[PDB]
Amino acid sequence: MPYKAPEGKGYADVATHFRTLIKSGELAPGDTLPSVADIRAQFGVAAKTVSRALAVLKSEGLVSSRGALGTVVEKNPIVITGADRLKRMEKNGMRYAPGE
Numbered sequence: 001m002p003y004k005a006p007e008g009k010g011y012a013d014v015a016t017h018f019r020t021l022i023k024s025g026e027l028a029p030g031d032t033l034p035s036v037a038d039i040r041a042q043f044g045v046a047a048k049t050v051s052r053a054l055a056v057l058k059s060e061g062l063v064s065s066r067g068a069l070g071t072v073v074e075k076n077p078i079v080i081t082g083a084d085r086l087k088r089m090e091k092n093g094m095r096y097a098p099g100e
Contacts, residue, residue, distance in 0.1 A: 001037075004044030011052030014043040018053055018061040022073060024099045029062050033071040 006013070021027040021042065027034060039050035057063045057073075064075030080086055087093055 001041035003041055006045045011049045014045045014049050015053035015056045015060055017043050018057055020097045020100045022062055027073055029074045032069055
């Protein structure tokens with residue numbers, strides 16, 4: 001784990017990279033949130049910034065406060081009914097992390 005420092009980005013980059021964690025990451029939907037340390041290296045972001053995007057990850061990263069198993073990532077599947085919402089047909093459809 002390389003502690004990757006945030007050069008000039010906020011909780012947008014983490015929200016973006018968290019969408020990857022939820023894919024294969026180890027943090028699939030149905031698993032509970034890791035400590036900020038895991039994010040801190042995966043997200044080249046500040047160790048407070050994870051806790052920032054987390055409030056977005058309720059809709060975005062699919063997480064919800066679950067007072068049983070803990071802060072488990074299965075809240076609200078992002079409104080994806082097409083590739084437009086996730087890939088955006090405005091921009092080029094180049095390779096994204098398909099198994100990270």
